[PDB]
Ligand binder design. Structure first.
Ligand SMILES: Brc1ccc(Oc2c(Br)cc(Br)cc2Br)c(Br)c1
Ligand SMILES: Brc1ccc(Oc2c(Br)cc(Br)cc2Br)c(Br)c1
Length: 1182
């Protein structure tokens, strides 16, 4: 929404840049004007053939006499037009170079200036400007927004003025040569703009319906794949597939309905567009029979008008490129034009010599850019004598850290002044002030250069002698010399990461080369290992003694030797004095001392599509007919102009033109009929395999075992996305792109035959010219992408050192050396600059070549179409036919290169989708094999079970676990922590087979038992019961599948679960909808329902996995009261964390490291004193 003045945007263009644009926009207008004139000449060549075409047939008497006057007229005329034609091509060759080269030159020259001024402005902002802004967005604003500015002031402006030249020049020739066709052509424009307007209303409204349609099926997939362990436990995998299959059935009916309507729309709009044109041309014919406009003049206007009419559309993108570059330049120039109060690039203020370093802080009130929300310093008074070292202590707020901030004048205070020596700090030059102040901060930062270079960031003029004395004066010399490469080592986020105490020592040496008169040490010892802390502390003590120093830290070891200590309470300076005096004061300071002491040939996807042997042959045969039918319109056009140029006696002409225009409209309606078929057939054929694919995938997905659904690769969202994308992508490959790719190869094929079977030596020439200009059009795009990738790689190195400069900004400004990063960024940009200079010459040459290759190709089309061909016995009507036929059949092949990624993006989506079906699990619920015992009573035997989870085979959970529980008794399961308690329930459900050992139920190993039948005897109840969106009766009846459960039966379970108070209180009762879609209720009712569906199954084994986990107050007392009634009649395994409710259990087992540690009845493990006795004691006391 915000934008820039047009003149301010070009503020960096002067002298030559203004001229380049002037000559550039000039030649660009010359380039545009060249095309409608080329069409004006195409009319004069027609009249030459038309005057001879009328007189040649007018004879029917003399023959050799027509070998004289006609050929002579053709000789002087065709040579004149071909001479003019060759001139236009040389014109476009020059102006198209001038057009693109000059504009890309001005673009490259200015963007170089923009990028330097921009980065200079970034480093010029004061710190308070950075505290309110995001540096990451700022750096991306540097590389991206400048690119948008470059796209808008580049060769696009030349293309814009080239287009308006065609537009103006087209309608000028349109009006002057005959303004009775222009107004007729404009009259059909609203119809074409209205038909394409129905497309923007149909596409936008129906694209939501499909994203709405599958969102109902993908919702089924979501609540299923999220509750996968519940449907797996209750075996609803046929139902959840059936539901998904039932929603897929509706999505395909809405998909074929959209295929019917969208193809009716496309064919009707195409027929309206072609009938609109054929009327404007048949109207053109009605004005030639009236002897008002020559047969060649109708072409001259009809072409120049339609050329300039579409030149509007070809200019609209360049308008958006310029406007976007304007608005992109707003926030950029806003930074450049913004002037700071602090500067630091300013050359102003005093530079005191013989600085003795007497600092004082006077009544300083301050607040960080958070402003009126917080005021961290309410008044202040602090002096520090020269040579002394004052220490600042404080409980919190870190108002200590603020004084170091103000001392470098990173901010100016709200009220009060900071005084170095006697002068106010704001009277001293900012840079010189930062140069007389050395800074060592808590987190040290080293730029990605050598050690000597990082030390060289203290002062640019320095020799390795000073570097050596500095690092030796910080006792950092000894440890770096052992490091290889000596001072020439590397540092940074990338490469040679060092100890913290060593990086700080380099930072102390960096600040030591500064030879500052003022020293500021902010928590430099804090957040550092204890051993190396003394090593750095020795250097800090050796860094002072020649300077006045303010130091802030939470280490009260470094503070004793300070001449003065200062305490803060709420930004107010409270206590000050020597260490001993503050202890006698027994104030804040004393208080803090005591406190701290694979693309491949996949035909089988087409073999699955072979379910429909028809519907394809219908579409293909219908598409090839539509292919063979398109050039016949060019054939009709060739003979509407052909018989009119070849007319001779004019009486027969007027009756023939009516017959052709009629047949055209009969071919158009027969084109509409065949287009709707090839669309509908492919559409329906695409929508049905969408169901088959999503059905087989969702079926095979419900086949895999819990081992697969635990994969971090496969989450519920990543599966629904893999489910939607892979099915829609393969539809596009076998869909429109194929019907089109066959319609077009038939379009060229039926066009190339007619052209080859007509004009001799004529088609053979055009077949030498057209492929070369097509290839030359391709190679230009390749060099364009290569230059684009190359320039992306080069400015990346610049923005990389810009990223380092601005992300570590607060450090660089503290060391000044901003001019250093300026010079580095400038040297980095110099290569893309000289690169951008060559880009203009290349871009202009390629564009001018492809334009000249199109214009010269046109001269050879007529000079050969006349002369050798028309001096013989070859007619013009065919040359026109071969033109439209070949040129259109080629431009129809241009759609093959556009649908190419639709094929690759589908094969990759097919690659996954063929494997996701074929993958088979270790435990397949679909296998009908298995025992299915007849004996009801259930035992459970865990024997020697070692189990590790397939996702984390690192820490084992079960190591030699052994339980046994008889029928009708409760097996309590206590554990120190982890799924060691829970893994029992998962293995009994046989979510996994154990690594070693085995688990039995009736004495039969479940591993050889039937998987589905095994889980059919289990009454699983988990922590968070997930209930699908349907009737609570269905959530209850979900407990028994393969049979519809009686209402009184699901009532019995709801009576059993004590949930019946709700189920009758509701208005809908058992038919109420739950799942946070129709109604919402608390977890206690959710659990009771899960208990009901558990015992609707009438299991012989309950499995209660921390059922009271998420529950509170009386809700626990009523759900436990329901669970306690559900067991005692069945085999039961309870792992609940309420050991008070486990007291009445037939056997309590303590799990330890996967082994059973203690076991026995409650009082038995209470008689013993150990883990279970400690478990019952800790949470009974707490
Ligand atoms: Br835009 C444009 C349209 C037609 C051009 O040549 C013609 C011309 Br002029 C007339 C017919 Br019919 C077919 C072709 Br191809 C040229 Br060169 C450029
Ligand atoms: Br009659 C008649 C035939 C073709 C005409 O131009 C074309 C041409 Br040339 C090719 C195709 Br495809 C469609 C149309 Br409409 C015109 Br205008 C009038």
């Amino acid at each position: 929404k915000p934008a820039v003045s047009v003149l301010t945007m070009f503020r960096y263009a002067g002298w030559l840049d203004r001229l380049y644009m002037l000559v550039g926009t000039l030649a660009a207008i010359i380039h545009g004007v060249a095309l409608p004139l080329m069409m004006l000449i195409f009319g004069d060549m027609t009249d030459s053939f038309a005057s001879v075409g009328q007189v040649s047939k007018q004879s029917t008497q003399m023959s050799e006499a027509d070998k004289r006057a006609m050929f002579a007229k053709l000789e002087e005329e065709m040579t004149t037009y071909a001479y003019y034609y060759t001139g236009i091509g040389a014109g476009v060759l020059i102006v198209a170079y001038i057009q693109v080269s000059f504009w890309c030159l001005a673009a490259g020259r200015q963007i170089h200036k923009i990028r330097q001024k921009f980065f200079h402005a970034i480093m010029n902002q004061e710190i308070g400007w950075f505290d309110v802004h995001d540096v990451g967005e700022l750096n991306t604003r540097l590389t991206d927004d400048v690119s948008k500015i470059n796209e808008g002031i580049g060769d696009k402006i030349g293309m814009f003025f080239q287009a308006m030249a065609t537009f103006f020049g087209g309608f000028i020739i349109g009006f002057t040569r005959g303004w009775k066709l222009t107004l007729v052509i404009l009259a059909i424009s609203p119809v074409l703009g209205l038909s394409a307007g129905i497309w923007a209303k149909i596409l936008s409204s129906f694209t939501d319906k499909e994203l709405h349609a599958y969102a109902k099926a993908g919702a089924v997939a979501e609540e299923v794949l999220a509750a996968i362990r519940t449907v797996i436990a209750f075996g609803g995998q046929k139902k959840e597939l059936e539901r998904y299959n039932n929603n897929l059935e509706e999505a395909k009916r809405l998909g074929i309905k959209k295929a019917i309507t969208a193809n009716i729309s496309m064919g009707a709009a195409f027929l309206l567009i072609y009938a609109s044109a054929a009327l404007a041309f048949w109207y053109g014919t009605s004005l030639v029979i009236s002897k008002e406009y020559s047969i060649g003049q109708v072409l001259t206007v009809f072409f120049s008008v339609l050329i300039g009419a579409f030149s509007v559309g070809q200019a609209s993108p360049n308008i958006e490129a310029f406007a976007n570059a304007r608005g992109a330049a707003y926030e950029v120039f806003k930074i450049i034009d913004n002037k700071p109060s602090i500067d630091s690039f300013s050359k102003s203020g005093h530079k005191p010599d013989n600085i003795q370093g007497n600092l004082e802080f006077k009544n300083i009130h301050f607040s960080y850019p958070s402003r009126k929300e917080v005021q961290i310093l309410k008044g202040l008074n602090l002096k520090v004598k020269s040579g002394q070292t004052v220490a600042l202590v404080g409980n919190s707020g870190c108002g200590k850290s603020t004084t170091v901030q103000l001392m470098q004048r990173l901010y100016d205070p709200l009220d009060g002044m900071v005084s170095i020596d006697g002068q106010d700090i704001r009277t001293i030059n900012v840079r010189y002030l930062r140069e007389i102040i050395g800074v060592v901060s808590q987190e040290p930062v080293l730029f990605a250069t050598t050690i000597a270079e990082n030390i060289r960031y203290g002062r640019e003029d320095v020799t390795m002698d000073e570097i050596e004395k500095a690092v030796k004066e910080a006792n950092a010399y000894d440890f770096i010399m052992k490091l290889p490469h000596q001072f020439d080592t590397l540092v940074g986020e990338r490469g040679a990461q060092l100890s913290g105490g060593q990086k700080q020592r380099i930072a102390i040496a960096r600040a030591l080369v500064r030879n500052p008169k003022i020293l500021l040490l902010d928590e430099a010892t804090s957040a550092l290992d204890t051993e190396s802390e003394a090593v750095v502390q020795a250097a800090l003590d050796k860094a002072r003694e020649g300077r006045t120093t303010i130091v802030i830290a939470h280490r009260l070891s470094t503070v004793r030797n300070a001449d003065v200590i200062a305490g803060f309470d709420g930004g107010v300076i409270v206590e000050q004095g020597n260490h001993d005096e503050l202890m006698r004061e027994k104030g804040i300071y004393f208080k803090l001392v005591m406190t701290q002491t694979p693309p491949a040939s996949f035909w089988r996807i087409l073999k699955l599509n072979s379910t429909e042997w028809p519907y394809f042959v219908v579409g293909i045969f219908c598409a090839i007919i539509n292919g063979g039918l398109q050039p016949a319109f060019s054939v009709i056009f060739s003979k509407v102009v052909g018989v009119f140029t070849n007319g001779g006696p004019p009486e027969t002409q007027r009756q023939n033109s009516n017959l052709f225009s009629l047949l055209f409209l009969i071919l158009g309606i027969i084109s509409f009929i065949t287009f709707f078929l090839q669309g509908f057939t492919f559409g329906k054929a695409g929508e049905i395999l969408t169901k088959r694919l999503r059905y087989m995938v969702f079926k095979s997905m419900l086949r895999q075992d819990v081992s697969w659904f635990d994969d971090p690769k496969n989450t519920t969202g990543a599966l629904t996305t893999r489910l939607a994308n892979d099915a829609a992508q393969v539809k596009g490959a076998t869909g429109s792109r194929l019907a089109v790719i066959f319609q077009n190869i038939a379009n060229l094929g039926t066009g190339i035959i007619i052209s080859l079977i007509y004009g001799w030596q004529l088609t053979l020439l055009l077949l030498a010219i057209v492929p070369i200009i097509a290839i030359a059009g391709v190679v230009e795009m390749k060099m364009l992408s290569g230059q684009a990738l190359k320039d992306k790689k080069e400015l990346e190195g610049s923005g990389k050192i810009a990223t380092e400069a601005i992300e570590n900004f607060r450090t660089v400004v503290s060391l000044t050396r901003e001019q250093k990063f300026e010079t580095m960024y400038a040297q980095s940009l110099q290569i893309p600059y000289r690169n951008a200079m060559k880009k203009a010459h290349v871009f202009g040459i390629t564009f001018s070549f492809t334009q000249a290759m199109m214009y010269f190709s046109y001269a050879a089309a007529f000079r050969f179409g006349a002369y050798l061909v028309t001096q013989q016995l070859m007619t013009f009507e065919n040359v026109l036919l071969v033109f439209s036929a070949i040129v259109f059949g080629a431009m129809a092949v241009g759609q093959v290169s556009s649908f190419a990624p639709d094929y690759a993006k589908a094969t990759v989506s097919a690659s996954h989708i063929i494997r996701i079906i074929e993958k088979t699990p270790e435990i397949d619920s679909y296998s009908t094999q298995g025992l299915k015992p007849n004996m009801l009573e259930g035992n459970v035997q865990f024997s020697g079970v070692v189990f590790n989870y397939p996702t984390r085979p690192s820490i084992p959970v079960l190591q030699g676990l052994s339980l046994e529980v008889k029928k009708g008794q409760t097996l309590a399961l206590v554990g120190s922590s982890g799924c060691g308690k829970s893994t029992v329930v998962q293995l009994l459900e046989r979510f996994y087979d154990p690594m070693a050992g085995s688990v039995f139920l009736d004495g039969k190993e479940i591993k050889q038992l039937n998987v589905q039948w095994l889980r059919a005897q289990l009454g699983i109840v988990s922590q968070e019961p997930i209930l699908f969106d349907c009737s609570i009766a269905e959530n209850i009846a979900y407990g028994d599948n393969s049979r519809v459960v009686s209402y009184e039966e699901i009532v019995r379970a709801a009576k059993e679960a004590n949930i019946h108070q709700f189920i009758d209180s509701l208005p809908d009762k058992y038919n109420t909808r739950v799942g946070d879609k129709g109604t919402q209720l608390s977890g206690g009712q959710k659990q009771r329902i899960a208990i009901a569906r558990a015992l609707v199954r009438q299991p012989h084994i309950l499995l209660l996995d921390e059922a009271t986990s998420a529950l509170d107050t009386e809700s626990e007392k009523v759900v436990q009261e329901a669970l306690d009634k559900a067991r005692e009649g069945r085999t039961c395994i309870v792992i609940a964390h309420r050991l008070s409710t486990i007291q009445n259990a037939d056997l309590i087992v303590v799990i330890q490291n996967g082994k059973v540690k203690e076991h026995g009845t409650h009082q038995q493990l209470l008689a013993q004193k150990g883990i279970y006795f400690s478990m019952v004691s800790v949470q009974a006391g707490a």
